[PDB]
Design a protein around this nucleic acid. Structure first.
Ligand SMILES: [Mg+2]
Ligand SMILES: [Zn+2]
Lengths: 1319, 653
RNA sequence: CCGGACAAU
DNA sequence: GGGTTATGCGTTGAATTGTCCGG
DNA sequence: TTCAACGCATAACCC
């Protein structure tokens, strides 16, 4: 049992490892990103509410006028989502915000004469999501690529190596707030540490702490040990500690129990650890000279003489010791400077700073930001509460606040958005600890050290910046303004906000122009993840490290997708099972196992959990509810295939499909061919264009249905059920009344899509594959779109192959194609072009639109109307005029058809502003446009009325019914019967009243369909009219075509060969294409021969069913052979049995199998070579599957048999047109006769540098005064060649260049003179 | 350029000058109101940066701008640099007189003609049509002459075809690696819509045959032909400048055609039975009676020009294969038949034509070598090439090898945890044993891949040269390297780990059976680095090439003899193993400095200042003299240049 | 006329 | 007081194609 | 608003 489309055509799937869950949808990064961007989400959490949280307080000055925020909502825009794109306007829903404004009276913080309640103030409009999750800016919808950037906060990297030619090991601590100023710290080769700002000049860090309302003692008392000494009459006894003698060699006598254990000149070892900690006597006979071996902490006043003994952080000396020993001061704490216990780094940076006080500690910060200004307390502090303690310039989100908590091993989660003293000291302590003996560094390439940003936050940021730039506006206009006698509409306007919000989405690095040529390219573009943009990774700045990615990304990112050329590894995506958290860090699911019992529960795990925890393997031998019968299972903890035991694993990989998402997952057996030598074919589907006719693949993987319904090109039954009627414009579907509502049940709407031209001349078309009377269900495809058939996916098509280089024509990569395609014309699509005819009112005679156009022919009047517009369906050639347009002086300045791009006029589109008189043709065009609307709504109205007839008569018969009021009664008066008053009667009344309401509900949009359609559009002032023509050119197969399949068959066509020269075989089957088995070592491409036999297997089955049904054997053969042909495989996870179904399902499904049996083979969990041979043996095919071939020229056998079979080939975009060009001579630049650039409109062509000097190196000296002198510079020599070649003489004397002498003219203004002499 | 309206858009050179003149107006106006020393001090600063702004910025502070955050375009931006006029007008400009079409193989042109299609050959030579209409009188005015060309009824192309043979054009390839990319091919007017190139020349440029770029160049004067007969063509420039190997490298599809041809069987079809005619043996070959590897002897006539060009009238009947005689009857005059008896691979065939130039000559040898592709096309048509699974044979001892390999790991790790060994040297031991643990499988697949094809022998079995399909091109050198064949059956080896050093866990299986995601990820992880680094090494190579090409260009030869009888000391440098380079590639065509004497008996070998081309060096190599004294380029008495004797002959000339 | 972005060898 | 070395900043970074929009 | 490689240049700095 399967779905109706699946039961209609069910594809065989293979596999030995059953899966538990299906494939979710991949469009979760735009719809979900924007829905949270615009919602009622108080406290912000990255939403418009977050924008309002910064403009919610608004305390004005001199009056305390409060402008509070209440709510915002967006209604239906003035323009829909299907006609605004056609008109060419900006799509924007009304961003209306309910703002309450209480302008308090002056001086009084409290008091208002009368409160003014602004109902939905108009600050502008923001784009919405039309039908797919994209933005619409200027006609064509715009897709902003999600940007990759680093995580907001502090990083710890090594960045060793180049250390000013010293080689001393160094580290750095780079901080990055959410959107504020960067505090990036680093180390010095001279064993120092300081602070920096925004990658700018260094700032002293041992003076700013004292500047922040601190003093000296809080500096020196928190970075060193304290060791109290004893001042007596002699030798200055002193009190030591094992926490000081742990690494400090006690070079003095240490007595314990009347004997010295550690004396001078010996190192304390483990035995001395016992000899010392077992005694730990404090009253030891320390000598006087060891007292000088310390460094004082602070100043001490001599208790005997009052003399300044020492100031701070200075080494004691024997004279100093005798200068304080003459007292009774038994409290002398000292520091502890070491080289391996404590960092000797803040020992000298204090002396490095010129001062450290209250006043001179601020002139440094005053002069670093505002030179030539006297220092001031308030101005100096303003920066401290601007770049460190602020809410509008420097602030961090919850992400930035909690990242530091984890980075510094904290416990709290939510705090403020500002830096704290504790954090800025701990970064100066754990960081100095990193050097000495502990610590670790974090790599930027790590997934947890980077942040992904999308449209949902970039738009919120833009709108919040927009609100903060207008916040102070009300404060300043209300500082000297009225007394609340206004309305909050004037000072807070819409033009600047709406223009900035709109431009910020269209003119940006991430605002990449959409390239609609493949629905798979549509999804690939939407899931494209890029690094460039505002605050990202630039292409010029790239080392060998940023180019290499952190290997811990398997199961989280698709590796097989990779850009080539200027950028490598810069374009990323999202895996199927894994997803990006709101934190931007990646995580992937795993199956929750226990020590012995495998549970089907799924948890989400990430790299940080993976580092410490051990994950088992997917393809692990399993039996009942789950037990690893094997003991030593290949596990992993840090990406290494660790071989660990069985009873510690609680998770393996969910499935092998979590690594690849969209790159090349449709190609089975990706292990045979490396992605390194397969990405040249795996990267060409992003530009491939669908053809006219496409066949189902014989071999795939099985994930084609989810990706097909994922793309927005199909018509899924969002509300399936009973299928009533299928139309070429709208599939008339509805469900029984039981599942919809008594009030306006309605019918299921499915409008059919017609041919259009989106971005890349792409003609999309949908065809209703369903029949008349075939029931469907929820989530069932109804109308097949491009490259789809019977609800499935088919991009390309299948054709047989041979492996035989004939006469060496396939020299490197060329291919040989016979005349089997050029006569059929099937491998081509339709491209619709567009040329814009500007009706600009030129000076001294505007541009008029009329048929009276000079220098035309008698054929023009037949194809042109009386207004100069070509007839609808009148073909044009090279040189015709689409719309007559002349400039009286008179010359024909209308549009001409260039030679080589001639097509057929199918659509002529005229855009004219309201006020300009139109021609009869155009008037008739909207005239027909309006009347088609009336009839097209009328049939919908009638079918809705008839459906409500079925619903109401159905409830009528169900219960009370009268024979007289049964069929002859009017179909409207269906609310007056003998039914008693109950839930049936009131429901019937509800149905009737809804029927009456819906019988007139349509008239509102009926009326709306004039005042928006009859009115003219608006494009730009200063032009009379803009008219466009959507000409379409159809091309055929011509010399110069290109071949590029899914396998990577990158080759250009060589020439044409006859079908007779095409080699036949023992029965003469015409082989479609023949490859060149020559580049196997250069291009390691082996994994195709084994899968080649699947094409023979499918054709063999299809032809056997065809022959077996041709004579129509009894059901004892039809249902027997169907059984055998559908029962196959050694261990498959799909059980299909058509014979056990009804006989009709047997024939109605066997009829779908005339050419082959679809096969779904996953790379790992699918059909293997053994399946290949068993299926070849299922029909009448040889075990080896090798077929001998005959010769078409001499008619013989060469030496060997040739493998022949069908693969699935697909078409690319570039054929000959993007490269074809031809030009001889004509117009050139204006400053000279230099040809223009590019080959598209008009210009010159490329040439290399080596031939430039190769010709000079040759003996021929005339090769230089021919190519760039009398070809591109000599204006009159050009006229000389024009005048004399047409006579016949072929000799031009070179004149003078007009490029070398031009440069000297502007330097002559600098005082340069030139002279001419001949020796 | 104007804008969308009645106004006009400004330029970079004027945007800032607008503001500096507007501010200068008010600064000068305030001067009449007795301005203090402050206004006069400040007004000079603005003119100082305005004048620096026009000249050049980005030296002091942040450069000013008037358009966006991007810096303004100064006067010294379009003159110098990558985008400057110096590298944009003469070094990558937009050239003219050329058309674009798709390249096909088209193995029809040989050296002289080309495959220029009809439309491409009609849409270019515009003025020559009007130049030739008036000769027969079809047109008397250019105005009316114009409106009989654009329609192309029957007379546009016949007139333009006869001016083709009287004026050859030049064709060059944009993706050119060598220096001799300029070859003279006469235009043709043939049907089709593509351009064909010589398959050897197409691979000669070493460019991907996937929609490359062509460029056509025509001489523009009469005197561009009288001198254009010896310089810009491949007829005389066969020798490559870089090396003694000429530009004509044997093709991969002809080398196999001769390597498998020279293969000798001991018992097959046509074995033993010998005919009495090379042509009748050839007929029995493609009639289905004689094999390409076969032992048949026929009356083959050999000739030698050891005389004064006189044919040595002789013949021979030796046991040859059937196609060697076919090649021999292509020799027009005659060469010592012993010269064609070899494996006929890369180097053997390369020095076939290399010595053929010096034996038979240049002009006939050109044709004799250009027909190699033609005569190998018969082989390509009759055999071709194919690959399949049956060529894969797993080694029989590989599974035992991999079974026994991991045993030592555990046997030493248990000693590590038992306190016998330390991971410091144990890790190095492990990565060293696994650095060679692939070699046993690598030579175990020799005896499982290249030793299979046997033949019968009078009733018994004889083993001879293997007939493995992938080994045909492997041993013949056509395609398939040692570093690639291991990737097929053997182990690809141990690549660099993400840490940077060698991986600790090698590759277990090959790409022919199942492979896990983790290790396939590791292999791709090691693999992308070469593709990443090729984007940068090529650019770095271009940097040095440009730094070394525009510096040595200024050289002129102004003297013939420098008047110096000295030079340098020539002796094959050798250190360590064997010497790789002889004197042959050192001195070849150079005027000797003085008379070299024989070391043994003091015999004058070269009498005076003479060249050293073929036989002089053959005298040196047979007399074993290492006292060569030739004029050296560094030691030359030539004013601004070097004389011809210090350099002598040059390659490609 | 100058850039951004995607894609191609 | 001659010579060595710490430290700031000068220059540059492949062949241009194809096509889209935006001032 | 994160370069790397190469290299002449002042201003200090070592006994
Ligand atoms: Mg190419
Ligand atoms: Zn000389």
């Amino acid at each position: 049992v399967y779905s109706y489309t699946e039961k209609k055509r069910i594809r065989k799937d293979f596999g030995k490892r059953p899966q538990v869950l299906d494939v979710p949808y991949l469009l979760s990064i735009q719809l979900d990103s924007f829905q949270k961007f615009i919602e009622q989400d108080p406290e912000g959490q990255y939403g418009l509410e977050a924008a309002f949280r910064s403009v919610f307080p608004i305390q004005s000055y001199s009056g305390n006028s409060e402008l509070q925020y209440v709510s915002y909502r967006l209604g239906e825009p003035v323009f829909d989502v299907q006609e605004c794109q056609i008109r060419g306007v900006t799509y924007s829903a009304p961003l209306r915000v309910k703002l309450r404004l209480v302008i308090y009276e002056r001086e009084a913080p409290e008091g208002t004469v009368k409160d003014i309640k602004e109902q939905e103030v108009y600050m502008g409009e923001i784009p919405l999501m039309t039908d797919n999750g994209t933005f619409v800016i200027n006609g064509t919808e715009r897709v902003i690529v999600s940007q990759l950037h680093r995580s907001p906060g502090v990083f710890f990297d090594s960045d060793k190596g180049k250390t000013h030619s010293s080689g001393k090991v160094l580290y750095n601590a780079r901080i990055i707030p959410y959107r504020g100023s960067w505090l990036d710290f680093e180390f010095d080769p001279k064993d120092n540490l300081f602070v920096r700002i925004d990658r700018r000049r260094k700032l002293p860090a041992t003076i700013i702490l004292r500047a922040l309302n601190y003093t000296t003692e809080q500096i020196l008392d928190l970075f060193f040990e304290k060791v109290i000494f004893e001042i007596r009459d002699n030798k200055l006894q002193m009190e030591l500690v094992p926490e000081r003698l742990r690494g400090e060699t006690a070079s003095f006598d240490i007595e314990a129990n009347g004997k010295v254990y550690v004396e001078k000149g010996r190192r304390i070892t483990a035995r001395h650890i016992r000899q010392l900690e077992k005694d730990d006597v404090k009253l030891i006979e320390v000598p006087v000279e060891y007292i000088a071996g310390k460094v004082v902490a602070k100043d001490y006043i001599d208790e005997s003489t009052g003399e300044l003994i020492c100031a701070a952080n200075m080494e004691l000396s024997l004279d100093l010791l005798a200068k304080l020993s003459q007292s009774g001061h038994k409290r002398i704490e000292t520091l502890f400077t070491n080289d391996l216990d404590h960092g000797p780094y803040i020992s000298e940076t204090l002396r490095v700073d010129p001062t450290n006080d209250r006043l001179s500690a601020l002139v440094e910060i005053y002069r670093m930001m505002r030179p030539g200004e006297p220092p001031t307390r308030e101005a100096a502090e303003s920066l401290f509460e601007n770049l460190f303690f602020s809410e509008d310039r420097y602030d961090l989100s919850a992400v930035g606040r909690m990242k530091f908590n984890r980075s510094l091993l904290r416990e709290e989660i939510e705090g403020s958005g500002i830096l704290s003293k504790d954090d800025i000291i701990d970064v100066m302590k754990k960081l100095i600890d990193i050097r000495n003996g502990k610590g670790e560094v974090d790599d930027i390439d790590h997934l947890g050290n980077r942040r992904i940003r999308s449209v949902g936050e970039m738009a919120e940021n833009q709108f919040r910046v927009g609100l903060v730039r207008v916040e102070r506006a009300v404060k300043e206009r209300l500082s000297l303004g009225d007394l609340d006698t206004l309305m909050p509409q004037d000072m807070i306007n819409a033009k600047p906000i709406s223009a900035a919000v709109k431009e910020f989405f269209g003119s940006s690095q991430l605002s990449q122009f959409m390239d609609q040529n493949n629905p798979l390219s549509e999804i690939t573009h939407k899931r494209r993840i890029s690094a460039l943009g505002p605050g990202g990774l630039t292409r010029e700045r790239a080392g060998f490290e940023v180019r290499d990615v952190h290997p811990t990304h398997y199961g989280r990112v698709c590796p097989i997708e990779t850009p080539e050329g200027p950028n490598i590894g810069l374009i990323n995506s999202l895996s199927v099972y894994a997803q990006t958290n709101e934190y931007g860090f990646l995580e992937t699911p795993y199956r929750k196992v226990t020590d012995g019992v495998v549970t089907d529960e799924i948890h989400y795990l990430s790299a940080i959990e993976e580092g410490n925890y051990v994950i088992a393997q997917a393809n692990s031998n399993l039996d009942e509810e789950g037990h690893f019968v094997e003991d030593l299972v290949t596990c992993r903890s840090k990406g290494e295939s660790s071989l660990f035991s069985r009873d510690q694993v609680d998770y393996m990989d969910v499935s092998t499909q979590q690594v690849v998402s969209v790159g090349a997952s449709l190609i089975p057996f990706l292990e045979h061919d490396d992605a390194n030598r397969a990405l040249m074919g795996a990267n060409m589907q992003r530009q491939a264009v669908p053809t006219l006719r496409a066949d189902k693949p014989l071999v795939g993987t099985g994930m084609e249905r989810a990706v097909a319904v994922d793309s927005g090109v199909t018509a899924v039954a969002k509300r399936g059920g009973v299928v009533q009627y299928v139309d070429a414009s709208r599939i008339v579907i509805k469900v029984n009344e039981d599942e919809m509502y008594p009030g306006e049940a309605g019918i299921d709407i499915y409008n059919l899509t017609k041919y259009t031209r989106s971005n890349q001349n792409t003609c999309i078309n949908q065809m209703p594959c369903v029949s008349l009377g075939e029931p469907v269900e929820r989530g069932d495809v109804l109308a097949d779109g491009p490259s789809t058939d019977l609800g499935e996916l088919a991009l390309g098509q299948n054709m047989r192959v041979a492996f035989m280089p004939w006469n060496g024509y396939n020299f490197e990569d060329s291919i040989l194609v016979s005349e089997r395609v050029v006569q059929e014309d099937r491998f081509t699509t339709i491209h619709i072009q567009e040329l814009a005819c500007v009706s600009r009112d030129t000076k001294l005679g505007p541009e008029e639109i009329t048929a009276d156009i000079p220098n035309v022919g008698e054929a023009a009047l037949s194809k042109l109307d009386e207004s100069g517009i070509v007839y609808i369906g009148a073909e044009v050639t090279g040189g015709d005029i689409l719309v007559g347009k002349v400039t009286p002086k008179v010359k024909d300045s209308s549009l001409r058809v260039p030679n080589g791009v001639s097509g057929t006029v199918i659509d002529v589109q005229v855009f004219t502003r309201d006020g300009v008189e139109k021609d009869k043709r155009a008037l008739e065009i909207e005239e027909m446009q309006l009347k088609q609307a009336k009839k097209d709504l009328s049939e919908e109205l009638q079918i809705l009325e008839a459906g409500l007839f079925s619903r109401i008569r159905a409830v009528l018969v169900a219960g009370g019914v009268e024979a007289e009021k049964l069929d002859k009664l009017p179909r409207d008066r269906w609310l007056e019967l003998g039914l008693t008053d109950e839930e049936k009667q009131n429901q019937l009344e509800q149905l009737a009243e809804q029927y009456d309401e819906l019988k007139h509900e349509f008239e509102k949009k009926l009326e709306a369909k004039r005042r928006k359609i009859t009115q003219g559009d608006d494009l730009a002032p200063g032009v009379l009219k803009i008219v466009k023509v959507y000409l379409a050119v159809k091309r055929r197969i011509q010399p110069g075509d290109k071949m590029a399949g899914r396998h990577g068959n990158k080759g250009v066509i060589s020439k044409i060969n006859p079908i007779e020269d095409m080699p036949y075989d023992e029965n003469g089957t015409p082989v479609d294409i023949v490859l060149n088995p020559l580049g196997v070592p250069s291009r390691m491409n082996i994994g195709q021969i084994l899968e080649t036999h699947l094409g023979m297997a499918a054709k063999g089955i299809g032809d056997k069913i065809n022959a077996m049904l041709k004579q129509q054997q009894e059901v004892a053969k039809l249902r027997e052979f169907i059984q055998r042909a559908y029962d196959l495989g050694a261990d498959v996870r799909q059980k299909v049995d058509l014979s056990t179904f009804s006989d009709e399902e047997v024939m109605r499904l066997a009829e779908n199998l005339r050419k082959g049996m679809p096969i779904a083979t996953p790379v790992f969990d699918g059909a293997k070579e053994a399946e290949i041979k068993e299926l070849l043996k299922l029909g009448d095919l040889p075990t080896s599957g090798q077929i001998r071939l005959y010769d078409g020229r001499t008619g013989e056998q060469f030496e060997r048999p040739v493998t022949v079979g069908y693969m699935y080939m697909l078409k690319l975009n570039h054929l000959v047109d993007d490269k074809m060009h031809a030009r001889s001579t004509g117009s050139y630049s204006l400053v000279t006769q230099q040809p223009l650039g590019g080959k598209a409109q008009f210009g010159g062509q490329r040439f290399g540098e080596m031939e430039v000097w190769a010709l000079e190196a040759y003996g021929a000296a005339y090769t230089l005064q021919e190519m760039l002198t009398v070809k591109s510079d000599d204006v009159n020599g050009r006229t000389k060649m024009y005048k004399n070649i047409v006579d016949g003489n072929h000799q031009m004397e070179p004149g003078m260049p007009e490029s070398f002498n031009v440069l000297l003219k502007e330097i002559r203004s600098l005082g340069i003179n030139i002279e001419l002499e001949d020796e | 350029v104007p804008l969308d309206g009645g106004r006009f858009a400004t330029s970079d050179l004027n945007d800032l000058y607008r503001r500096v003149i507007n501010r200068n107006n008010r600064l000068k106006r305030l001067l009449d109101l007795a301005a203090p020393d402050i206004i006069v001090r400040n007004e000079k600063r603005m003119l100082q940066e305005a004048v620096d702004a026009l000249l050049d910025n980005g030296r002091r502070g942040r450069a000013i701008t008037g358009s966006n955050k991007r810096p303004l375009k100064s006067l010294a931006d379009m003159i110098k640099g990558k985008q400057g006029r110096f590298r944009q007008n003469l070094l990558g400009k937009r050239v003219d007189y050329s058309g674009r079409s798709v390249i096909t193989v088209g193995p029809y042109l040989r050296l002289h003609q080309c495959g220029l299609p009809k439309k491409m050959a009609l849409e270019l030579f515009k003025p020559f049509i009007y130049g030739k209409l008036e000769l027969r009188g079809l047109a008397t005015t250019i105005k009316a002459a114009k409106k009989m060309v654009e329609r192309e009824e029957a007379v546009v192309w016949d007139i333009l075809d006869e001016v083709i043979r009287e004026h050859p054009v030049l064709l060059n390839r944009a993706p050119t690696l060598h220096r001799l990319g300029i070859q003279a091919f006469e235009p043709v007017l043939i049907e089709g819509k593509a351009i064909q190139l010589h398959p050897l020349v197409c691979a000669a440029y070493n460019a991907d045959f996937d929609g490359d770029q062509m460029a056509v160049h025509v001489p523009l004067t009469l005197e561009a032909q009288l001198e254009a007969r010896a310089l810009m063509m491949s007829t005389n420039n066969i020798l490559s400048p870089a090396n003694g190997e000429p530009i004509i490298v044997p093709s991969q599809d002809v080398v196999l055609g001769l390597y498998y041809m020279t293969r000798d069987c001991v018992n097959a079809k046509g074995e033993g039975m010998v005919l009495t005619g090379p042509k009748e043996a050839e007929r029995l070959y493609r009639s289905g009676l004689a094999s390409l590897h076969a032992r048949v002897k026929v009356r083959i006539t050999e000739y030698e020009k050891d005389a004064n060009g006189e044919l040595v009238a002789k013949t021979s009947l030796k046991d040859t294969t059937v196609g060697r005689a076919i090649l021999w009857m292509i020799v027009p005059k005659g060469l010592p038949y012993s010269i064609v008896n070899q494996a006929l691979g890369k180097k053997a065939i390369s020095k076939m034509l290399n010595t053929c130039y010096r034996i038979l000559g240049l002009k006939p040898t050109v044709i004799f070598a250009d027909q190699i592709m033609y005569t190998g096309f018969a082989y390509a048509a009759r055999s071709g090439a194919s690959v399949g699974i049956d060529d894969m044979v797993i080694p029989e001892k590989k599974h035992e090898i991999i079974s026994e390999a991991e045993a030592e790991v555990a046997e030493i790790q248990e000693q590590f945890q038992s306190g016998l060994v330390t991971a410091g040297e144990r890790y190095n031991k492990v990565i060293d044993i696994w650095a060679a643990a692939n070699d046993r499988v690598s030579k175990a697949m020799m005896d499982n891949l290249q030793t299979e094809t046997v033949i019968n022998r009078d009733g018994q079995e004889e083993k001879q040269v293997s007939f493995n399909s992938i080994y045909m091109m492997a041993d013949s050198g056509a395609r398939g390297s040692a570093a690639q064949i291991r990737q097929l059956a053997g182990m690809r080896g141990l690549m660099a780990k993400p840490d940077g050093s060698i991986i600790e866990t090698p590759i277990t299986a090959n790409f022919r059976e199942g492979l896990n995601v983790l290790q396939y990820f590791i292999s791709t992880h090691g693999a992308r680095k070469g593709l990443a680094d090729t984007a940068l090494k090529t650019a770095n190579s271009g940097y040095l090439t440009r730094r070394l090409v525009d510096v040595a260009q200024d050289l002129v030869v102004t003297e013939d003899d420098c008047g110096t009888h000295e030079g340098i000391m020539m002796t094959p440098v050798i250190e360590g193993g064997d010497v790789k380079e002889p004197l042959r590639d050192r001195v070849l065509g150079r005027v000797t400095a003085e008379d070299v004497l024989k070391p043994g008996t003091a015999d004058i070998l070269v009498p005076r200042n003479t060249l050293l081309h073929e036989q002089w060096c053959d005298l040196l190599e047979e007399n074993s003299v290492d006292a060569v004294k030739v004029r050296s380029v560094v030691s030359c008495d030539t004013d601004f240049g070097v004389c011809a004797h210090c350099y002598g002959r040059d390659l490609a000339r």
